[PDB]
Design an enzyme around this catalytic site. Structure first.
Site, mmCIF file in Angstrom:
data_model
loop_
_atom_site.group_PDB
_atom_site.id
_atom_site.type_symbol
_atom_site.label_atom_id
_atom_site.label_comp_id
_atom_site.label_asym_id
_atom_site.label_seq_id
_atom_site.Cartn_x
_atom_site.Cartn_y
_atom_site.Cartn_z
ATOM 1 N N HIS A 49 42.179 44.677 33.774
ATOM 2 C CA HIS A 49 41.377 44.991 35.278
ATOM 3 C C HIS A 49 41.883 46.494 35.783
ATOM 4 C CE1 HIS A 49 39.514 40.893 35.904
ATOM 5 N NE2 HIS A 49 39.416 41.320 34.486
ATOM 6 N N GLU B 21 42.973 47.145 38.497
ATOM 7 C CA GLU B 21 44.278 47.064 39.175
ATOM 8 C C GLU B 21 45.550 46.884 38.369
ATOM 9 O OE1 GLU B 21 41.258 45.641 39.474
ATOM 10 O OE2 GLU B 21 41.219 43.862 40.804
ATOM 11 N N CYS C 249 40.138 40.161 42.024
ATOM 12 C CA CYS C 249 40.052 38.986 41.562
ATOM 13 C C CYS C 249 41.301 37.932 41.782
ATOM 14 C CB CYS C 249 39.547 38.719 40.137
ATOM 15 S SG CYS C 249 41.012 38.791 38.898
ATOM 16 N N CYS D 248 44.481 39.349 40.005
ATOM 17 C CA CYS D 248 44.856 40.566 40.262
ATOM 18 C C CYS D 248 45.645 40.272 41.871
ATOM 19 C CB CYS D 248 43.617 41.691 40.588
ATOM 20 S SG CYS D 248 43.302 42.356 39.071
HETATM 21 ZN ZN LIG Z 1 40.963 41.410 38.575
#
Ligand SMILES: [Zn+2]
Ligand SMILES: [Zn+2]
EC number: 3.5.4.33
Lengths: 161, 162
Positions: A59, A61, A95, A98
């Site tokens: 992701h 991040e 999310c 993360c």
């Molecule tokens: Zn994420």
């Protein structure tokens, strides 16, 4: 003596994250772009690379965290020293994965755009960001909502396909 | 297309190996978590915690292993989704909230683990991400906890005296 990004500089960073979200949208990735600023220097960038990389953990991040780690490697600075004073500017609420990662890295502040209704870890589905968890990472602070309408419009059009 | 399933004895075998790895982690001043990932009767990824060595708070044993499986895919010509979706994870401690979220996203179907993770467990202790009703984010997965939990908690306990 560290430097603190003003409001206008924040808007400026969130503008650059949105452009990265647009780039991700067009590479058939989830429209999420993010930036990590330390001592007035851009120390990590990242888009979602899950489809490119074929690795579901990558992701925006996570891609960022690696770039910052790479940054530390080369500046001679230690990661704890850097991450503890770093601000994250992301297009979508991090999310649960993360958000749990950012606690563990101890980033104090996250500025994000729209809510992550599916899996968001700053209040949407869970609030890992503020969780009272004594012996694991530190809680962090969020400033949500910056250009949420646009962010979510990208998210929506992406989820049709 | 005829994939091989590890038996009970074979599970016991892989957990012993994860236990040895947890010992090695302990003695390297790392949180004592070791793990293996098995696909079609092959050891497709190993991993211990590397947080101190690496100075990156996210390199939990499970994340080390996932990188190794992705590396195995590169070289075997097989796709990640085709492998992870039929991979069993064998771990010393209950996956944390971060790792459990990852395992959902990778769609590993079965985790066999040892003792509980009281501080940050994501399979029931603090939260149950493994079995959460989350329609459009990964798949939920199954757990078989408790295999040699006592030794696993004994290692963790000894480690938290530093
Ligand atoms: Zn994420
Ligand atoms: Zn973990």
């Amino acid at each position: 003596n560290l430097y603190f990004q003003s409001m206008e500089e924040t808007e400026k960073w969130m503008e650059e994250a949105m452009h990265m979200a647009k780039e991700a949208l067009e590479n058939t990735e989830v429209p999420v772009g993010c930036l990590m600023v330390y001592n007035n220097e851009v120390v990590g960038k990242g888009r979602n690379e899950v489809n490119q990389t074929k690795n579901a953990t990558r992701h925006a991040e996570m891609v960022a965290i690696d770039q910052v780690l790479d940054w530390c490697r080369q500046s001679g600075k230690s990661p704890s020293e850097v991450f503890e004073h770093t601000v994250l500017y992301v297009t979508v609420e991090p999310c649960i994965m993360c958000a749990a990662a950012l606690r563990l890295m101890k980033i104090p502040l996250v500025v994000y755009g729209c809510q992550n209704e599916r899996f968001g870890g700053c209040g949407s589905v869970l609030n890992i960001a503020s969780a009272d968890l004594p012996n694991t990472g530190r809680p962090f602070q969020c400033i949500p909502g910056y250009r949420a309408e646009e962010a979510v419009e990208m998210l929506k059009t992406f989820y049709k396909q």
